Symmetry: D2
Subunit: 449 residues, 4 copies
């Protein structure tokens, strides 16, 4: 009777086959609770768990056969169990609703997915932290407005990304905690009428706790929005790092080149070596953001309790989980195999970036910063008008700006001296970077457990 086109638009089995195992696992747990509730005889339970375990095997062996009438994974497994053991299968449905199987399964899938994602995320952070430890002596320009600002260590750069990524890791753990709440036993919205043992369900399925209200457990998708939100910000961080590496990979900047494994050429232009890995990653930010936008829209203005609209969550979660997994591993390969050009990073170190240091120089000699700033500004301009860099002005030139300049300004013109000024926690001085590295190694240790 169902209109074929609507039935097709209604089918979620194509993607939600990814929930085949957690669905059996959840059915198994419920079968045991039903036996304890007196709905199944221990003899029936056996037939049921045996059938379910068999269906699990069919899916893992890639031999399960999806039929036309299967509008979703839940309907598939129920059909299969019935054709295996008959009428007994039908007892498993007692007090159970699809509205609760759907969030229970997706949460089970998400818990497993987060572990994998976490593992990869931590490996990415580690890769950045460990390379930062190895390349701690490298100094290059730091930018604001994409204009050379003040010199910083390449390790300080790798660590800013590592640090941001660590907050992503942290948010990921917080979301996992609310994901880890058992919704099974909420029924279609009013709860379970059998005095089902929810605690037994909880430990069996390995959730940290149970849902507090049946109407909310079945209507909410905060856990989907949260996931999508944190994943989006994680992607945002990756788009910024991509933007950085792609620009630094240009021939104009020349700071680095990715490995051949993470680049591709051009079937038309023979000279090309393109940073595809990073561009792909940068574009995924939009992809994941679209998933977040869609779910927020799907939810807005919907009435309590369950609504068929909610079915759009599955595909969005699965797609973002797969994007993360791929994106994180690729990012790792890139960071660990890319080749920096210590020579070019060094050449890019030009005197004008030391203009702030030149002003502090005068400040140390007594001049108030505002004046010191304008004086340093003049030297920058004098050198420009003269067609040279500031370190090439003469001492009398500096005196023409302020007699406060003494022969010892020569010490201002030393990049190692520049970065080494920033010892206060968080700065780019080498001792601060080593401190950060240690802090991050600890943070990771704690994130892992």
């Amino acid at each position: 009777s169902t209109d074929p086109i609507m039935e097709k638009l209604n089918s979620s089995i194509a993607y939600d086959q990814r929930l085949s195992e957690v669905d059996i696992q959840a059915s198994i747990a419920y079968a045991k609770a039903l036996e304890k509730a007196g709905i199944l005889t221990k003899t029936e339970l056996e037939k049921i768990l045996s059938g379910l375990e068999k269906i699990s095997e069919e899916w893992s062996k890639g031999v399960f056969v999806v039929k036309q009438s299967d509008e979703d994974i839940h309907t598939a497994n129920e059909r299969r169990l019935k054709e295996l053991i008959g009428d007994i299968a039908g007892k498993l449905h007692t007090g159970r609703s699809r509205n609760e199987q759907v969030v229970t399964d997706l949460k089970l899938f998400m818990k497993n997915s987060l572990s994998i994602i976490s593992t990869h995320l931590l490996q990415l952070i580690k890769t950045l932290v460990e390379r930062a430890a190895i390349e701690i002596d490298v100094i290059l320009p730091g930018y604001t407005h994409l204009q050379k600002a003040q010199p910083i260590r390449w390790s300080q750069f790798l660590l800013s990304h590592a640090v941001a990524l660590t907050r992503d890791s942290e948010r990921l753990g917080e979301v996992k905690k609310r994901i880890n709440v058992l919704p099974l036993g909420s029924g279609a919205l009013a709860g379970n009428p059998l005095d089902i043992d929810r605690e037994m369900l909880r430990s069996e399925l390995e959730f940290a706790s149970i849902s507090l209200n049946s109407m909310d457990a079945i209507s909410e998708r905060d856990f989907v929005v949260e996931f999508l939100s944190v994943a989006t910000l994680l992607l945002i961080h990756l788009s910024k790092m991509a933007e950085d590496l792609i620009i630094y990979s240009t021939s104009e900047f020349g700071f680095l080149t990715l490995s051949d494994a993470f680049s591709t050429g051009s079937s038309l232009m023979p000279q090309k070596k393109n940073p595809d890995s990073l561009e792909l990653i940068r574009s995924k930010a939009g992809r994941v953001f679209g998933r977040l936008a869609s779910i927020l829209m799907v939810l807005k203005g919907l009435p309590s309790t369950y609504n068929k609209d909610l079915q759009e969550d599955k595909e969005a979660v699965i797609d973002v989980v797969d994007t993360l997994t791929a994106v994180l591993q690729v990012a790792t390969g890139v960071i660990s195999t890319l080749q920096i050009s210590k020579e070019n990073m060094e050449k890019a170190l030009t005197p004008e970036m030391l203009a702030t240091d030149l002003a502090l120089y005068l400040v140390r000699k007594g001049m108030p910063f505002r004046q010191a700033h304008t004086a340093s500004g003049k030297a920058v301009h004098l050198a420009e008008t003269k067609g040279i860099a500031i370190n090439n002005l003469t001492l009398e030139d500096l005196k023409s700006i302020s007699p406060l300049f003494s022969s010892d300004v020569s010490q201002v013109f030393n990049f190692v001296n520049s970065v080494e000024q920033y010892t206060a926690l968080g700065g780019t001085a080498k001792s601060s970077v080593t401190t950060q590295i240690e802090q991050l190694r600890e943070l990771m240790k704690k994130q892992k457990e």
Copy 2:
């Protein structure tokens, strides 16, 4: 050499196989232009067109074989042609870039897709217009704030949706016009170096014109954003109609019930008959919006010219084209097979909705509207305090509010009289509705051609 994970993240063949035919068609057109440009001998052209036509057959017969190395459809067809005719295949690549094949193919796919979508959209509008013509005598409540406002014809309701949908149709035609501009011959960004005959390409591929600048033709995706944008607004309209029908389908409202073909029951609650068709449609608004959001993000801040980030467009377009096709046809089935309850729509017609008419009554007798409004307000409240509807107050009751009320107020209390006040173009009077119906039939006639 390419990292396997990055290569997988980079593959677009899974979805872009949908472009198999337009890609051959575009290669065929270019092969003929290359022969005219002196790159191919008429003998070579023959081998080439014959090979291409053969590959086209493989795809349509569902026998084409995708190999590991095929990162996209373009790479697949090029590989296949080479293994069919050898070295000659390689001449087809002359002066051609993937950056141009990609937008040429997607535009070719979009042109064909729009025709199908248009056909369905027009059928949906027709369905609403024709039912509105049949059910023109039905009157029910009209709402603002979901509170009963003034009575309107059910046909006036069906037509508001038809009208909005017609603007969707119109926007769809405008987008098609800019989609219909040939980008082939832009190369990787600098244009074509062979003095290729772009006009020949244009007519051959059936585009209305050619791109003006090669750098823009290869960098832009306005045609994707536009499509996604209009599709999103179209979905918005459908979410509002869905919201309406779902609410009207409630037992509390009781105005209508969808057919069984567009509903489904509940495996747990035996009494349920749910309007799945409409909820599915309403949720797609979010889905399509997410696609729009993702592409806008993918594009923002990207430098000229082509960037690998752009590859995310394919899957978003294909997904939205398929959503539209399904959603439009389902919407049509729903509107044409749903059953209204003329009796309940009639029962819902209550006197308080005529309070505005009661104020105009006094206005006709000389009272300024502001005063007429407060007087009518009092009658509404008097009736409430008295526990009756306003048409049940006595004439002396109305006189206690304003002596201006005469025995002829009885004429105010007639719903057919209410709606029939709105004869000015656009209103709910029957003559206005018939006018609208005629206007829409014409609009559709013009949209179709």
Copy 3:
């Protein structure tokens, strides 16, 4: 020199005057650290803190005078201090960047704002929890697909919203923790060169800790995205509750009416009483979501470190903070003053919603659920074809469906009996609702501290 139009587009003083106080407070803290770093003499510090305190007074008395050249609050306060104490003011700028003042100020503003928001959020949850305790005996329909499902307690409904809102409260606390990290002392990106005492800054400004990397502290806006994200989900929850109350406020449903303080009439239609409060709230979901979308877009693909693009964060945060504050308080008024119609909620309780209970009845007598479900389905249909409700079928009618039905089915037809089946934790049975109420009172107690 600056183009007047660009300067206007660049000015953020209109909105960022809201940061006038935290900016002084942050300048005060830095002045004291500069004295300890040897940049200011204790005599200079005095003049500085005295001047700053004076500027603080000007803003709080609403007498501060913004001049043309003030492109932001930071520039305003610096100008004012200089015209008050002269050259000494300029020493305060030593080692300080706008890039760090900007995030330090906004975080200070956000910390204060979250406290207010939290206070209001907790009051909203309390309002729902306490009313749920008072109206615990009320039963009405529960819905899925906006179709009557199974009976539930009105208190179970109020609590689903309370529960969701509690997760919003929890997420709000997590975000506050990362907001509470001091970024001051990061300079323009390389850190602070004076060995400034960041710990002194931390305790002085009351942050829980300090930023780990100067490049990240100045480039990131995770704290803005997080805030916007959680606020958006909070709004989503409020849009669903609004959708519920507006629908329940219809005359068709008739379950409740809001108070006059939270409604408005119509200048045209005298009978109208509209639920403006709820519609306003529902629409804010979109408003806040737009703010989230904008910031995510502003950030995507931006290079390290600071970029002027980031300046868009201020107005988005301030607007959402003000929306939350207003929305939360209004929501509270609505819930606490609305009037339910116990009589209509009772009348809406119809027999078909007990069809699931009727199937369990047969299940208890031995029949497998699948069969019990179809049997109950038949009774629903028999009653329909007969034009009566199911509780009106005769016992022999039920026997015609299944001889398993005995005279005691009469017990199935009792709504208090229906809801009382759900005693398992989370359900709608009265003992479960009282449990929830207790749990939520505790949760709130912990959230508050």
Copy 4:
């Protein structure tokens, strides 16, 4: 009675004062139609138009006084007219609803706003087209993946942006057409009951036509979504151009520097000259996108007809109209006053970008492209391994790759020769660029009228 906080959240006068004039203008038009409908005496009309004209003066002189009770502009003007002429003012409300004043006013405001925006947009395109005509001999690198691709003319670059901006202009005109439809006379939803002369209203207010259905005219906001959508894509284009100019403004690229009027320095780093104008513009893309996202969300799932949720449209439209106006003018200043470095653009022209030309060279001599591509690839690599550019390999070196290379390959190594290959329409050859310039001058001529 209205809760003060809800009343504040409900007030739209702060921003919708921008609609003060179009609101009077719309009231004036309706007053004249009411007189013709027999509701006002010609004597009353006079008092009314005189009062309205007076209120118009108050607003334009900046002396109108907003009172507490004014929840919107419509309520303000109605109050003011009443206190000026008394009871007569109240007759103007006859048959009129706020639901129609609101869309009529906003459309009137949008029509005027589009004209201004169009004027500025066309000036921006002109600025790019005319500079492209002046700097037509300049050649620099063209990029894909931000990697040097093939040489192109700077004019070809300016024109790709001009061309995209022209589509923005075109879409803007299409939106204006649907904006130009008169909604006045739709009442609260059922239409107008006075047989009001809508055609008279149309010409009087200068709309191109009238709305077809009263229910749609009052419920829709397609005209807002459309506007926001096109404005967003326009901003997208501007974010890409900004991304380009900011990168080209780097010292690493060194192709250009903006004028001082469109840059700003750093209060901390004396050497800085930052491209604020472009970064501000790039960030507005997100701002405008957020406005689009919010309105789409506000609309999704809302029931017919009017809902208070719709009130969020005003502020979004006004904000985007003001952003466009500022952004467009600033963009113009930037393009017209920026200074390119013809010398550096020339230096950036390196031999590897000619590798495609080198392959075509062999193709002309008979070699199939695929082979020609790999041969050219080898030369690129040989030169790398040798530490020189390809134009420095010896003829015998090229022979070692393919004996097909003859002394005349020297002609391949000429950049003017490179770009001049692209004469086919749209390419970067000089004759193609002059063609584009002419086409765009015409397009603008037509857009203007």
